[PDB]
Design a protein around this ligand. Structure first.
Ligand SMILES: *[C@@H](O)[C@H](C[C@@H]1CCNC1=O)NC(=O)[C@H](CC(C)C)NC(=O)OCC1CCC(F)(F)CC1
Ligand SMILES: *[C@H](O)[C@H](C[C@@H]1CCNC1=O)NC(=O)[C@H](CC(C)C)NC(=O)OCC1CCC(F)(F)CC1
Lengths: 303, 302
């Protein structure tokens, strides 16, 4: 039992920032940082506006007095409002005393983050997930979950990277960064939008193989190597993402810890793809995991 | 379609209670509730002591001044101490305003809880665990993690059920309730301890198969049915826990949601046990998952 486990970041710093935002009877979640509340702009939609909302026209009919923002049941009065891409920015009359040190970041495909799933401004649960190559997430969300956020924590600083907006017909999820710019080609309206065909996150498969070596499972290592270009051409024929120069460097620490060169681990993965596992397991499993990152492996080696 | 994830409870209410406890050069985590700090008693051991500790002897050799308790950058003054089973209770001269409504619960095998893994008094990660039938937990704990706690939240009440103490040679973990009594046959000493042979938590496998159907993965359903007794015969043959009628009752709501009678899901599981998965996956897993309770599935899927 290796102890390598998917973990969420402790959510308390984000819990202290969750509020509910209501227009009429539509309620979703918002993020309260200093004296601003961020939330998805479709809170202003009625059922008849959802199919193809004219958000600019809808917001013309709205005043500060139209928005009910609550921390629990305590109202926070709105003193200003504007739209920023697919988000509303609501200025409120109170600076959140629980505001952590924070940044807004744009996540890249293959990277992971924690999601604090919230309903009516009340946190329900926290889980880890990855941004897929096709710019969706395999989340877990019910009605009322919009405005739940995704985040990473680095020491004392919360990096917010995702705000939740919609579900796609295949049951995966789409959303924006905290500037309101969607990840992927998606738009916030009540229409069926197909995601592109997904691929396997090669960087994380390689991390998982390094994790298996660290734990003493090494049957899949070989005495051969590959060039990066040759590997990437084979990868794409197996619907694996190509490796980038950044990916190779991210794997530096695991390569150094194990003494297995990145391109030698790529050669091992190429052999697994072409030959299959033919029965065997890796870290107790028959299929290769692709949502456990190099950062996760390294972090969980020692205390 | 909701999707389906291993989901922990939000950890904020517990994070506000974590402190660091040091005695000599041993440091671990404590739980600060009102004016009491709870922590594993082996904080009082040196390296040598841990091989065969006489804890009553070791503790009478300490005073209040022997314990350094720190809440971030602030030392808390220890003004009394006592031992209850394998925990220490340190009385401090400050009350924690962040104390949630709470209770102490001893959980039963099959039940799940969230773990807030902490190092040097600082929260690092949160994940979901089940109490195994053999009274271990398959955790992720490194040096410095002792005193990390497991918990559930109902309404606004935190039910603490686990405090972490040790790792076994197999890599699984053992600890206590918040009364200091170990789950299982384990003892807090630096020796290699084996657990009893584990079994699979049938009620949870069934709840997870229902979660799979709710999310549209239903290849394992079939036309067969079974009685409860004939299911339990096969279950026990395969080292699965028997199902009681009270357990069938618990699955009622998931049954009504999917329209799949509990005993029909049992017949599906019986076939999975006898035939294997034939290389197929359920909710992306190549094995039958038994660390989701019915409540965990309902929480997420309704
Ligand atoms: C917290 O103090 C610490 C947590 C463990 C360290 C590694 N993973 C853990 O979960 N607990 C311990 O170090 C205990 C202290 C004893 C006095 C109870 N000891 C422990 O976990 O030792 C694990 C060893 C035991 C011998 C072995 F061969 F089985 C290898 C594992
Ligand atoms: C906001 O809470 C909500 C979250 C979704 C509800 C169920 N799961 C979710 O993730 N968001 C929405 O309901 C959006 C609102 C738009 C105006 C942005 N709509 C949405 O997600 O539609 C989902 C449907 C639409 C396409 C489909 F018909 F193919 C099936 C999914």
């Amino acid at each position: 039992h290796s102890g390598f486990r998917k973990m969420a970041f402790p959510s308390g710093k984000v819990e202290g920032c969750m509020v509910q935002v209501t227009c009429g009877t539509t309620t979703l979640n918002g993020l309260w940082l200093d004296d601003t509340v961020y939330c998805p702009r479709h809170v202003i939609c009625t059922a008849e506006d959802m199919l193809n909302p004219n958000y600019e026209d809808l917001l013309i009919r709205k005043s500060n007095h139209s928005f009910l923002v609550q921390a629990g049941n305590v109202q926070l009065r709105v003193i200003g409002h504007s739209m920023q891409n697919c988000l509303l920015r609501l200025k409120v009359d109170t600076s959140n005393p629980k505001t952590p040190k924070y940044k807004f970041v744009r996540i890249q495909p293959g990277q992971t983050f924690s999601v604090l799933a919230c309903y009516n401004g009340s946190p329900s649960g926290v889980y880890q997930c990855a941004m897929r190559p096709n710019h969706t997430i395999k989340g877990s969300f019910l009605n009322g979950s919009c405005g739940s956020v995704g985040f990473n924590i680095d020491y004392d600083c919360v990096s917010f990277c995702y705000m939740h907006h919609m579900e796609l017909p295949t049951g995966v999820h789409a959303g924006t960064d905290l500037e309101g710019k969607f990840y992927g080609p998606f738009v916030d309206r009540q229409t069926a939008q197909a995601a592109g065909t997904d691929t396997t996150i090669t960087l994380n498969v390689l991390a998982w193989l390094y994790a298996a070596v660290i734990n003493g499972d090494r049957w899949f290592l070989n005495r051969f190597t590959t060039t990066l270009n040759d590997f990437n051409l084979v990868a794409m024929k197996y619907n694996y993402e190509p490796l980038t120069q950044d990916h190779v460097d991210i794997l530096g620490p695991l390569s150094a810890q194990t003494g297995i060169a990145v391109l030698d681990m790529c050669a091992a993965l190429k052999e697994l793809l072409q030959n299959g596992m033919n029965g065997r397991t890796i870290l107790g499993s028959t299929i290769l995991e692709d949502e456990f990152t190099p950062f996760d492996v390294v972090r969980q080696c020692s205390g």
